[PDB]
Nucleic acid binder design. Structure first.
Lengths: 58, 201, 37, 117, 101
RNA sequence: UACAAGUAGUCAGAGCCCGUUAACGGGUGAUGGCGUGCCUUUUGUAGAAUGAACCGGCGAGUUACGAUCUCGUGCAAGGUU
RNA sequence: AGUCUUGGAGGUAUGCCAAUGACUUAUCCUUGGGAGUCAGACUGCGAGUGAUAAGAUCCGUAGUCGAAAGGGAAACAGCCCAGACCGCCAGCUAAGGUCCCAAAG
RNA sequence: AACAGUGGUAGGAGAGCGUUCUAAGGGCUGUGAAGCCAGACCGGAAGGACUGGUGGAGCGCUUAGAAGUGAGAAUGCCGGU
């Protein structure tokens, strides 16, 4: 568990939905990293913005 | 409160009680501030006036012609004249609730009581209306700065004296008000005027 | 209360808003009325 | 009461005209054009305080490239080797000084060469 | 002469010369010490991995000041956007003492 | 300063001349990089949209009476002339 | 509010509803005061539309400019990357690039 | 103290700087006031000092109060060039 989600790209130019998703993830600045427990909900919201974030497992 | 009684000669070992409802009130600084602003207004005359763009001499024709025609030589942007808003004659006076006035005067009196700036005199009588005698009496009581004297019913020998002394003002019991109490450092009042002020308020 | 230490009650007096006196005050050119409306 | 006002206007315009000292012709004389030039100068100064940091790094890279090619390397290979050896903490600016003032810094190029094998 | 890193920046120092650092706290008269010495050039040269192990440069504090004022002014044409601001960046004047131990 | 192409400044920078409210000082600047005035208006301006020869002075959200809202003070089921 | 659960119904070859659990998030309702705004522009997706590929034609739908500077596309409102509190002669990258102009094979 | 944040037109909200006058307290100034000229000083901004020259008689500080309250644009008005 304990995934680290890192915003790799900017949210400028992306439609609102992915912006709301990444904001819900807790990411505000670019190259910001966050720690979340491994679930299926967090995984799903990851795949909806998968091309704007890199994810690694602890 | 109790304040030492004093005589014209400057010395007394007596004492007098002041009614606490008038000379013991906890002062209300905000009420005193509004009292000062109201009374210090309503002294101003307001006789000021400025000429409009229509009250300036001339201006009817449209200045231009040829061999177009636009405006008036009296528009506000011309050197000639025409002031846009300017002052206009009006009054500045207003009123306070009566209870507020009573509270303000009581607060100022009590405040002056606290700072020991009050001297209660048995009586102030002058056989002769000489400015010199008032100066001697004032020095006897150690009053070196602006002072306010309150009498019972406006005796004339005291009014005539001290009229020329540059920092002294004499009023009767029903003439006291916030400005001349706050302004003058010290307060001389006769025992009869104390009774009259207490019984009025 | 001495005549050289007058203090208003806190909150009783507000400074008037003067409109049309520079762009740094927020009420400059169009004077708060915006464009034609 | 009436308020005239001349002193504040004179002082405020004189400050700008004094800031415009040294400009060409009318641009140090007349208030209207001096004000415009002073504003333009403020913008330029901000932009160029950023571009200065941009430019000195470019100069440093050029000098490092020259001094490295004097040893048989290129800038890219030398930087990769230096980073691969942990000695890379050393900057570009400090490297460039140790290129115009002590070419015996070749020691660093030797270390990078050794690590690149 | 060594190469120090103090203000998220590196400097080259030789004994006796006066340098200007970022605030660097401390107080006038105190003796500061630097730990991260990245290179000790001179006769014997000690290129060090990350930092030359066992290398310290002492120094003395002279004054804490602020530089000449910069007036930052920016504006946008046609949009009535102005902004003016002052800036004096604090520094620290320091004299290099013994550049080893 | 007489081989040089420019919204005229800004950042880097020798040389020369000075010496200050002593301060990482002042004046001028050979060369290098970057850089399409201000205002109004418009979806959009560097424009062949508009205005200003230059400098100085003067030049625009007030007052009265009603309505309503917030804050302050006094008194309070009463408050006020 | 996002997402996964929970279930079910709705298709003939992706959706809809409730749902109460979570795990993340800090928003959203009422009342009152004050407003500005009512010719927007361009680009990309669709495939609603000549449902086809369209162009059309609007329809949606997203983005940017307007109100956004910085790097790239020689120059370039709307394209690509990316959102400037202020200093530094510090480091790592994005788009885009590494013969010279011009930083790097 | 630990986090988080700080582009911005219309627009909403907040905190301030200056000017003339009035009131109170405190003061300056012919051993030189206001005004004018110069300077390499101080503050985050509006701004504020200190020295020198000219000037030759008035001015400012603290707290309040009141406004004919701050100019770069109106093919503005008047003067000078």
């Amino acid at each position: 568990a304990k995934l680290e989600i890192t915003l790799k790209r900017s949210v400028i130019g992306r439609p609102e939905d992915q912006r709301v998703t990444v904001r819900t993830l807790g990411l505000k600045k670019t190259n910001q990293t966050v720690v979340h427990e491994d679930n299926a909900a967090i995984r799903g919201m990851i795949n909806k913005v998968s091309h704007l974030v890199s994810v690694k497992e602890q | 409160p109790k304040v030492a009684l004093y005589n014209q000669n400057g010395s007394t070992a007596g004492d007098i009680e002041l009614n606490a409802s008038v000379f013991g009130i906890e002062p209300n600084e905000s009420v005193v501030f509004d009292a000062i602003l109201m009374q210090r207004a309503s002294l101003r005359q307001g006789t000021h006036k400025v000429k409009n763009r229509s009250e300036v001499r001339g201006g009817g024709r449209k200045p231009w012609r040829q061999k177009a025609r636009q405006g008036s030589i009296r528009s506000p942007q011309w050197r000639g004249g025409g002031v846009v808003f300017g002052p206009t004659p009006r009054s500045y006076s207003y009123k306070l609730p009566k209870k507020v006035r009573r509270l303000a005067i009581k607060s100022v009196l009590s405040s002056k009581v606290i700072d020991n700036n009050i001297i209660v005199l048995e009586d102030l009588t002058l056989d002769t209306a000489k400015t010199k005698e008032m100066a001697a009496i004032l020095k006897g009581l150690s009053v070196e700065k602006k002072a306010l004297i309150v009498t019972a019913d406006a005796n004339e020998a005291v009014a005539l004296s001290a009229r020329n002394i540059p920092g002294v003002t004499v009023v009767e019991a029903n003439g006291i008000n916030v400005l001349d109490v706050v302004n003058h450092e010290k307060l001389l009042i006769t025992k009869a005027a104390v009774e009259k002020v207490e019984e009025v308020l | 209360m001495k005549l050289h230490e007058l203090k208003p009650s806190e909150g009783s007096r507000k400074t008037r808003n003067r409109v049309g006196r520079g762009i740094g005050s927020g009420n400059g050119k169009t004077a708060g009325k915006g464009h034609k409306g | 009461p009436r308020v005239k006002g001349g002193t504040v206007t004179r002082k405020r315009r004189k400050k700008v005209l004094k800031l415009a000292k040294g400009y060409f012709g009318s641009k140090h004389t007349l208030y209207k054009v001096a004000n415009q030039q002073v504003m333009k100068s403020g913008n330029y100064a901000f932009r160029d305080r950023r571009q200065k940091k941009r430019d000195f790094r470019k100069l440093w890279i050029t000098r490092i490239n020259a001094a490295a090619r004097m040893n048989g390397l290129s800038y890219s290979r030398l930087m990769h080797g230096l980073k691969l050896s942990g000695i890379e903490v050393n900057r570009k600016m400090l490297a460039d000084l140790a290129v115009n003032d002590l070419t015996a810094f070749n020691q660093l190029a030797d270390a990078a060469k050794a690590q690149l094998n | 002469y060594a190469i120090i890193k103090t203000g998220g920046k590196q400097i080259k120092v030789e004994e006796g010369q006066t340098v200007y650092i970022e605030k660097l706290a401390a107080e006038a008269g105190e003796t500061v010490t630097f730990e991260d010495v990245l290179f000790v050039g001179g006769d014997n040269v000690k290129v060090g991995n990350p930092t030359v192990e066992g290398a310290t440069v002492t120094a003395k504090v002279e004054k804490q000041g602020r530089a000449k004022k910069i007036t930052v002014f920016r504006y946008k044409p046609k949009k009535n956007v102005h902004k003016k601001q002052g800036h004096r960046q604090p520094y620290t004047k320091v004299t290099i003492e013994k550049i080893n131990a």
